[PDB]
């Protein structure tokens, strides 16, 4: 049933692609488990990150990018639709100008493009969460 975590999969995205994730956190929100979703430019995990999506369950969500190994301006968001100990559905909708990240099919965060999504060659899901499904649309 469970998908290996860290999960690393080759993928290429464009305007219209939707990334579907279905999993559950491994800890209660008080202990602050994290969830991180990184869009890499190569299959090697050390490659640059076009879209960095790291959740601190129960406190906040921050997004950033890594360009030539350098972290850029981090964007902070306090919207926390995630529910303690409950399964989540994560969908990231790719738009021409930005990303549209929905939580359980409900829009929660957006992140304007810093690197055009055509440079993405790998998508990695890794942090203190259980993983059940991973889909590329």
């Amino acid at each position, epitope marked *: 049933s469970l998908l290996p975590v860290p999960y690393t999969e080759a993928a290429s995205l464009s305007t219209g692609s939707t990334v579907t994730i279905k999993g559950r956190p491994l800890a209660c929100f008080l202990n602050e488990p994290y969830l991180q979703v990184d869009f890499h430019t190569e299959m090697k995990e050390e490659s640059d990150i076009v879209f960095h999506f790291q959740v601190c369950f129960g406190r906040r969500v921050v997004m950033n990018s890594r360009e030539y190994g350098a972290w850029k301006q981090q964007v902070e968001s306090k919207n926390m639709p995630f529910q303690d100990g409950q399964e989540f559905e994560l969908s990231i909708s790719v738009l021409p100008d930005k990303y549209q990240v929905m939580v359980n099919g409900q829009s929660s965060y957006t992140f304007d493009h810093r*690197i055009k999504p055509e440079a993405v060659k790998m998508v990695q899901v890794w942090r203190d969460i259980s993983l059940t499904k991973f889909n590329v649309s």
Partner: antibody
Amino acid sequence: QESGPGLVKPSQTLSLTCTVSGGSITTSYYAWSWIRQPPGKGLEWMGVIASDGSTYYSPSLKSRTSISRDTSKNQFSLQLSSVTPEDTAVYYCALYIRGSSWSGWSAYDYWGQGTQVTVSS
Amino acid sequence: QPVLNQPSAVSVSLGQTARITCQGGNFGYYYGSWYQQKPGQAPVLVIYKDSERPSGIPERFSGSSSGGTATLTISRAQAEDEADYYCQSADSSDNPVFGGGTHLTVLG
């Protein structure tokens, strides 16, 4: 509308300001950047100040560049410290229109007319 | 200092199609833009996001991009296209770059 022209002796610090619209309607006054052009040379970026974000600078000029803004005056001002004869250039004020956030590859539709700054002894 | 590499001067006869390349720069990752500058006049944006042109710019202007190079295409040259053309991109989201500048001469 740009103002603040003049010649300056090396090692001094001169200021340049950009006025509210200069021909731009219904402006949320978003994403102001500084681009300079050494005489006969190509354009050389200096910095930017976004409404969504805060500010960015160029490493070469990071130490010597200061950008301020007075929204009540709806102007934002440059201060380039420790000027040298290389800083002689035409300084432009460029406005970023696109409603998306400011990025490096972003373009500026409305450019200020520019003013010549001459740095020599 | 980081500068894009582009030819200094390119000549085209009236009625021909002109192409200006912006090489040595960081593309694929980023987007590309183009400005037209007249002597003693402020630069004017010609191309943004490598494909689209702003309002007022004729359909004669088009842009291409691939790998680490971008190519500006002027399909039907006229006299007013005699100017300096600058390409622009970034080394990173927080750092734009500008090209060395190309002087285009419209012959004929």
